[PDB]
Design a binder for these strands. Sequence first.
DNA 1: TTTGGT
Length: 512
Amino acid sequence: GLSKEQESIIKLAENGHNIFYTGSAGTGKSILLREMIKVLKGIYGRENVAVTASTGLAACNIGGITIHSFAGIGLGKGDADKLYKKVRRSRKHLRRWENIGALVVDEISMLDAELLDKLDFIARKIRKNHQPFGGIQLIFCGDFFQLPPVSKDPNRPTKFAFESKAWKEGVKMTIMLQKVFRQRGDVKFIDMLNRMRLGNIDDETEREFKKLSRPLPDDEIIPAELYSTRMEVERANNSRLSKLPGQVHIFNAIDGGALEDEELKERLLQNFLAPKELHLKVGAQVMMVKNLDATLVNGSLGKVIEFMDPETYFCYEALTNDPSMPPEKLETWAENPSKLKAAMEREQRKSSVKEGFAKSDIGEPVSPLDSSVFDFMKRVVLENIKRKEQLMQTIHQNSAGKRRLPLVRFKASDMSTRMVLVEPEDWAIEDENEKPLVSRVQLPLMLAWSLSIHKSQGQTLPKVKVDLRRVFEKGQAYVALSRAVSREGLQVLNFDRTRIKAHQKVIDFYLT
DNA sequence: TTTGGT
Ligand SMILES: Nc1ncnc2c1ncn2[C@@H]1O[C@H](COP(=O)(O)OP(=O)(O)O)[C@@H](O)[C@H]1O
Ligand code: ALF
Ligand SMILES: [Mg+2]
């Protein structure tokens, strides 16, 4: 049941008119966007609405890719003129600009004007036009009192989206939803959150937020944890991995390939987001960090089911697709593993580097599969003929020396679940000659119980812990505390009335 | 202290 106000903003997009809506955290913005994305596709075709957002996880909430990933601009720190020449040299991305009828963009507060103007320049010169965006309908979404775009230099403040040429050209009104939905039970809580949107903590709200520094109820509901910087996040994801039953599976990065520099080259190789050492467990929660295909993108969340190799997986897949299979078909690949590679790879320079990656030793023992992974056959009267359960296990044991890789179940935007075997991807910073300067093979997965407050923006975390220990940018404490649905579900550490203040540029916007 | 690429 969408609200009347939420429904009208959807209709309004039938105008073709650029619309920009807003309203404090958790008002239904990104939900109604989902249905407006349905009508904009029904107007220009599925393939011609660009559904993007500022951070790849926030993109998945509305079912789409990052603004950079759609645009083809990479990081887009380059010259306005430069990016355009890069986009036009990619058929996929060129004709993507040629053909789009809408650009939906959610969590706009983290878009920086400098980039919007670059995208405007690209949208025009490619679409051969001079309208606001080469005439693309803009749907803009968010709350500017939440996180601003990331200022690397904090003595060049990064010029929020509305400071741009392109915005003043194409946004000449703001709509504003006012009813709050996320916290909708805890009314005092909402008022407490609203006076945090501005920096108006009083003597009483502080005391009431400090009452929330108690411990979350301890049950099997694993709580989400939000911290300011990536260190405390990484630390709390391990503090949860250590608490999870089972051994860790260490995945060690493969690194090359230019001559001897080490003053920053490992400052370059810690600076990859691809840890030199990635630990996982069965039942862990991971998030993809590389755009890999249409529905498996940076910001997909998943839960590791067990670890397999290709061959042990090809068999496991067979059984999920025929869950009442005759047990004979298995023993043919169980006890005749020559004919398994027969049936498997009949289905169709960097290949050797990702070969030696995740290679168990020729003799290292092989922990058997979990009995969790056979619960799908566990819907019960007469004849249990899961000898098949033991059969798979024998197949798994043959992977001694083979390449064992985490089998993840991902739950997509539309809650469509999809299981993939996560091969390693590779990262590289390359020169003008593309030379092997600095390379790293690694799994494109991160643990996802904890999130930086930035990646936390967009999500609803019913049970959540918040540690405002290092909060630095304006809005950061608002975004974090505003994730929780109830005070019951919330725990807050290190409350500091003075590290909670609002950006002046934005109050100026909301009144000039 | 933070995001973003294939
Ligand atoms: N029409 C609605 N009625 C009831 N609850 C809603 C409605 N729309 C959204 N919600 C809930 O409120 C929360 C906020 O929705 P969302 O669109 O993410 O807010 P935000 O505006 O901050 O992006 C969501 O978790 C959603 O479950
Ligand atoms: F803008 Al939001 F949760 F998507 F506050
Ligand atoms: Mg939203």
